[PDB]
Design a protein around this ligand. Structure first.
Ligand SMILES: [Au+]
Ligand SMILES: [Au+]
Ligand SMILES: [Au+]
Ligand SMILES: [Au+]
Ligand SMILES: [Au+]
Ligand SMILES: [Au+]
Ligand SMILES: [Au+]
Ligand SMILES: [Au+]
Ligand SMILES: [Au+]
Ligand SMILES: [Au+]
Ligand SMILES: [Au+]
Ligand SMILES: [Au+]
Ligand SMILES: [Au+]
Ligand SMILES: [Au+]
Ligand SMILES: [Au+]
Ligand SMILES: [Au+]
Ligand SMILES: [Au+]
Ligand SMILES: [Au+]
Ligand SMILES: [Au+]
Ligand SMILES: [Au+]
Ligand SMILES: [Au+]
Ligand SMILES: [Au+]
Ligand SMILES: [Au+]
Ligand SMILES: [Au+]
Ligand SMILES: [Au+]
Ligand SMILES: [Au+]
Ligand SMILES: [Au+]
Ligand SMILES: [Au+]
Ligand SMILES: [Au+]
Ligand SMILES: [Au+]
Ligand SMILES: [Cl-]
Ligand SMILES: [Cl-]
Ligand SMILES: [Cl-]
Ligand SMILES: [Cl-]
Ligand SMILES: [Cl-]
Ligand SMILES: [Cl-]
Ligand SMILES: [Cl-]
Ligand SMILES: [Cl-]
Ligand SMILES: [Cl-]
Ligand SMILES: [Cl-]
Ligand SMILES: [Cl-]
Ligand SMILES: [Cl-]
Ligand SMILES: [Cl-]
Ligand SMILES: [Cl-]
Ligand SMILES: [Cl-]
Ligand SMILES: [Cl-]
Ligand SMILES: [Cl-]
Ligand SMILES: [Cl-]
Ligand SMILES: [Cl-]
Ligand SMILES: [Cl-]
Ligand SMILES: [Cl-]
Ligand SMILES: [Cl-]
Ligand SMILES: [Cl-]
Ligand SMILES: [Cl-]
Ligand SMILES: [Cl-]
Ligand SMILES: [Cl-]
Ligand SMILES: [Cl-]
Ligand SMILES: [Cl-]
Ligand SMILES: [Cl-]
Ligand SMILES: [Cl-]
Ligand SMILES: [Cl-]
Ligand SMILES: [Cl-]
Ligand SMILES: [Fe+3]
Ligand SMILES: [Fe+3]
Ligand SMILES: [Fe+3]
Ligand SMILES: [Fe+3]
Ligand SMILES: [Fe+3]
Ligand SMILES: [Fe+3]
Ligand SMILES: [Mg+2]
Ligand SMILES: [Mg+2]
Ligand SMILES: [Mg+2]
Ligand SMILES: [Mg+2]
Ligand SMILES: [Mg+2]
Ligand SMILES: [Mg+2]
Ligand SMILES: [Mg+2]
Ligand SMILES: [Mg+2]
Ligand SMILES: [Mg+2]
Ligand SMILES: [Mg+2]
Ligand SMILES: [Mg+2]
Ligand SMILES: [Mg+2]
Ligand SMILES: [Mg+2]
Ligand SMILES: [Mg+2]
Ligand SMILES: [Mg+2]
Ligand SMILES: [Mg+2]
Ligand SMILES: [Mg+2]
Ligand SMILES: [Mg+2]
Ligand SMILES: [Mg+2]
Ligand SMILES: [Mg+2]
Ligand SMILES: [Mg+2]
Ligand SMILES: [Mg+2]
Ligand SMILES: [Mg+2]
Ligand SMILES: [Mg+2]
Ligand SMILES: [Mg+2]
Ligand SMILES: [Mg+2]
Ligand SMILES: [Mg+2]
Ligand SMILES: [Mg+2]
Ligand SMILES: [Mg+2]
Ligand SMILES: [Mg+2]
Ligand SMILES: [Mg+2]
Ligand SMILES: [Mg+2]
Ligand SMILES: [Mg+2]
Ligand SMILES: [Mg+2]
Ligand SMILES: [Mg+2]
Ligand SMILES: [Mg+2]
Ligand SMILES: [Mg+2]
Ligand SMILES: [Mg+2]
Ligand SMILES: [Mg+2]
Ligand SMILES: [Mg+2]
Ligand SMILES: [Mg+2]
Ligand SMILES: [Mg+2]
Ligand SMILES: [Mg+2]
Ligand SMILES: [Mg+2]
Lengths: 174, 174, 174, 174, 174, 174
């Protein structure tokens, strides 16, 4: 039976929102894994660890907002397994930042495909939701990660452990 | 090569900590799923939703503390997929509370098996970690969920939607 | 029928908790009796009276925490008569302090037997409960009472009513 | 030998005060038992539990004031065993309230018999003590418990677990 | 003659506590020596000096708590010479941090042997004392020192005097 | 090779400063031992214990200032074992105060010999250091301990446990 609230909400959009919820939860899990890598005693970069833990908690918030959207529009949430991150060892601060850049660009591509679907189904509320809450967040995240990668490369990372140490203090510390 | 920090930390304990990290992340995901079920427009119990979202965020903290422990002791974190919850539809406030009770007792049983292992490997630091940060938390969680189940049953849930409405306001609201 | 909360809680542990509840209530009653002895007009040591009344109220709190534990774990409270203290006349400040020392060491021995049982039944939550809330409390109580007995003996109690008077002011007063 | 303070204090009054001390301690123990019944996971009415625990602590204060009176008048305190409550399972909020009503009327009858004795022995200080500190307290307690019993009966207790739940929140909660 | 407070306290446990007191005083002396090495005009790392002086004062507190425990349990303190540190010249910030790591792991091993003894003598109060006040302190200390060693190695210490200078400012300074 | 800072600092003065550092650490250890003697349950004079613990921590500060002096002048610290106190049992408050008096006069004699050496080597900076930071401290310490010994003797210590009790409260308490 049709939800009493549902209006102009295509079944393909509903399914795509469920896919996006899984992707945001996956991103949360990737950042959680990265964070505790930097907490290892043989890595020991505490501001890298705090930066990625914050990004993990952000992504959980991104997922919860999409779950709230699904219910606002009268769709039904269907959850899937959250796959483990492809990587147990992230190697260095520079490599983790490059992996985060690549993650945040795949999430953006998924959101752009979701916006194209919403446009094709003439769902301006969903278009505005994506634009307002997700697309500029992603552009800002990608720009920040690019900036971080550039600085770590210019400073001599990953071979310079002094580069990663000083970036941890001065950019992330900090 | 052996971590420079590692002392009295058995390889079986290290593996069991990695298993427990996955279980805590799984519990976080179960509570996330339960929370947004109560946010559906055709369920609409906002204090059930907030209660379970808080429990989800707690469990993420439980996982992060175990990741920090692994690194404190010189073990190595190895992550696995976070399985989706077995349930997409949690049916009622009473049923979700019963499922949470059953989840929090399985997590407790895993922690008791972890404590038995730590005891068998003569690891008093790990025993104290489990006792201090996990075992009484679990006893309190189980007692609270039992209390909630009892009240919902006595009030007439799940058949009485008025019971679940009033429990949402007065116990969870609240 | 089994409590919906009960997990890893042996029936022998449940019975031993009920025994301990009675012992804590008994200790509360002993200290109540001691307190009002020092309120008699022919004893008249008001800080001895306040010290023992505080210890009485503490013990009631110890009993209530064990009652809460019984319910947290899904056991059932069964109460017994609270026996009157073996003594109506406590004779002196020194003698009451010696009787309190002997009481607080019997309570400790009961708690150590309860911990041995919890250990034998592989109940780490109950072990941690006893260690966290009871065993160091008892060690501190026993040490304080020993200290008090020593000072009263060194000052010349019980034969010196001036010793007990001055201890009442300066140590208990006070 | 006669206390240096004793004046106009009959030996029968002294004995009756000792009886009343035991009764007040018994009442304290009854309310303690009732309180933790409502803390069970299969009863779970936390404001019933707090209400009865407060009444328990009140009664201990009633006992201590009578112990102080005994010494003020030059009598000698003699303590007896505190009998366990006649009931381990109090069945419901309504039944516990009825049992408390019956307890508070038996305590009142004992205090009225104590006042008749004080009157017959021409002890106006003891009459005034009873009137000032005990008799209106009892009338207020009995009226409050009657009010509570009436409301629980009108709301449909004990068969309505919703009645007891809502009384717990709104009258005792509360 | 037996202390009036002593209960369930084995003579082997008493002796082991005296050994541990000496070890904690020794650790205090090692850190004192390390601190003033970094105060030399030809070493001149003032935050290394302050870090180790703080660790020295901590260890004195660890010793004093064990002396208080000995008396709480009715044992008798017997002191031994505090041996001088094996090292007059600690060579570098990295080497001192490695020596501190090795010291804090030997202290941990002594505390684990003390806990095994307490367990074998069925002394749950002493087990809880060790777990509560010592074992997690040690795990945290060892993890922090491991982290410090890792960062100094990654930054290029000891050959890079710039590495030790910058670690002194940014991690210890500071 | 000669320290770049060293000027007018004789090698005999450098060695004598190292001897004095050991003596101050020894004094710290003596007072630590005395403090915990008064913490025993069969001694139980808590203000004697706090007085001596404070004196212990003072002496550690005296040692650290001499270590800083050694480095200020370009000398090299060389540490020796800290001998255990000659006494495990200090017998009484009066005896401990007499032992402290004798300790503080031996430390003074060592400082006067150090000043004679500095004078003979025409080292006015070292003379002024000793005069400014040590010699009047010692005169004050010796005068205070003499005062304490006198009062304890006049009050009837050590045979009067009441004397030591009251001195603990009124002079040290206090
Ligand atoms: Au990778
Ligand atoms: Au990978
Ligand atoms: Au990657
Ligand atoms: Au990557
Ligand atoms: Au659109
Ligand atoms: Au289910
Ligand atoms: Au299911
Ligand atoms: Au379930
Ligand atoms: Au379920
Ligand atoms: Au263990
Ligand atoms: Au007795
Ligand atoms: Au007796
Ligand atoms: Au006794
Ligand atoms: Au006794
Ligand atoms: Au256990
Ligand atoms: Au009954
Ligand atoms: Au009954
Ligand atoms: Au009844
Ligand atoms: Au009744
Ligand atoms: Au009267
Ligand atoms: Au060395
Ligand atoms: Au060496
Ligand atoms: Au070393
Ligand atoms: Au070393
Ligand atoms: Au133990
Ligand atoms: Au001596
Ligand atoms: Au001696
Ligand atoms: Au001496
Ligand atoms: Au001496
Ligand atoms: Au001079
Ligand atoms: Cl639609
Ligand atoms: Cl559709
Ligand atoms: Cl799946
Ligand atoms: Cl990857
Ligand atoms: Cl922007
Ligand atoms: Cl190991
Ligand atoms: Cl191993
Ligand atoms: Cl996997
Ligand atoms: Cl399920
Ligand atoms: Cl608790
Ligand atoms: Cl069970
Ligand atoms: Cl069983
Ligand atoms: Cl009985
Ligand atoms: Cl007795
Ligand atoms: Cl303590
Ligand atoms: Cl009379
Ligand atoms: Cl009479
Ligand atoms: Cl009796
Ligand atoms: Cl009854
Ligand atoms: Cl009134
Ligand atoms: Cl209502
Ligand atoms: Cl013993
Ligand atoms: Cl023994
Ligand atoms: Cl020695
Ligand atoms: Cl060394
Ligand atoms: Cl921690
Ligand atoms: Cl020179
Ligand atoms: Cl020279
Ligand atoms: Cl030496
Ligand atoms: Cl000596
Ligand atoms: Cl002066
Ligand atoms: Cl005085
Ligand atoms: Fe996201
Ligand atoms: Fe958890
Ligand atoms: Fe107790
Ligand atoms: Fe009463
Ligand atoms: Fe230590
Ligand atoms: Fe000194
Ligand atoms: Mg509908
Ligand atoms: Mg997806
Ligand atoms: Mg860390
Ligand atoms: Mg982000
Ligand atoms: Mg699957
Ligand atoms: Mg648009
Ligand atoms: Mg837009
Ligand atoms: Mg925007
Ligand atoms: Mg290594
Ligand atoms: Mg697992
Ligand atoms: Mg909502
Ligand atoms: Mg929880
Ligand atoms: Mg896979
Ligand atoms: Mg244990
Ligand atoms: Mg524990
Ligand atoms: Mg705890
Ligand atoms: Mg049941
Ligand atoms: Mg018993
Ligand atoms: Mg009085
Ligand atoms: Mg006590
Ligand atoms: Mg009976
Ligand atoms: Mg414990
Ligand atoms: Mg404790
Ligand atoms: Mg008389
Ligand atoms: Mg009676
Ligand atoms: Mg409760
Ligand atoms: Mg009442
Ligand atoms: Mg009897
Ligand atoms: Mg009146
Ligand atoms: Mg009145
Ligand atoms: Mg003795
Ligand atoms: Mg040793
Ligand atoms: Mg300096
Ligand atoms: Mg330390
Ligand atoms: Mg020797
Ligand atoms: Mg512990
Ligand atoms: Mg701890
Ligand atoms: Mg040079
Ligand atoms: Mg010397
Ligand atoms: Mg003490
Ligand atoms: Mg001094
Ligand atoms: Mg040697
Ligand atoms: Mg001068
Ligand atoms: Mg001066």
């Amino acid at each position: 039976s049709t939800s009493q609230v549902r209006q102009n909400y295509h079944q393909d959009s509903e399914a795509a929102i469920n896919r996006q919820i899984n992707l945001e939860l996956y991103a949360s899990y990737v950042y959680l894994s990265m964070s505790y890598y930097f907490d290892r005693d043989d890595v020991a970069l505490k501001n890298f660890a705090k930066y990625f833990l914050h990004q993990s908690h952000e992504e959980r918030e991104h997922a919860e907002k999409l779950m709230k959207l699904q219910n606002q529009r009268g769709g039904r949430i269907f959850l899937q397994d959250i796959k483990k991150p492809d990587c147990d060892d992230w190697e260095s601060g520079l490599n983790a930042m490059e992996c985060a850049l690549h993650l945040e660009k795949n999430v953006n591509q998924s959101l752009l495909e979701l916006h194209k679907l919403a446009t094709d189904k003439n769902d301006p509320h969903l278009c505005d939701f994506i634009e307002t809450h997700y697309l500029n967040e992603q552009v800002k995240a990608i720009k920040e990660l690019g900036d971080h990668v550039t600085n770590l490369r210019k400073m001599g990372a990953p071979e310079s452990g002094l580069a990663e140490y000083l970036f941890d203090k001065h950019t992330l510390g900090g």
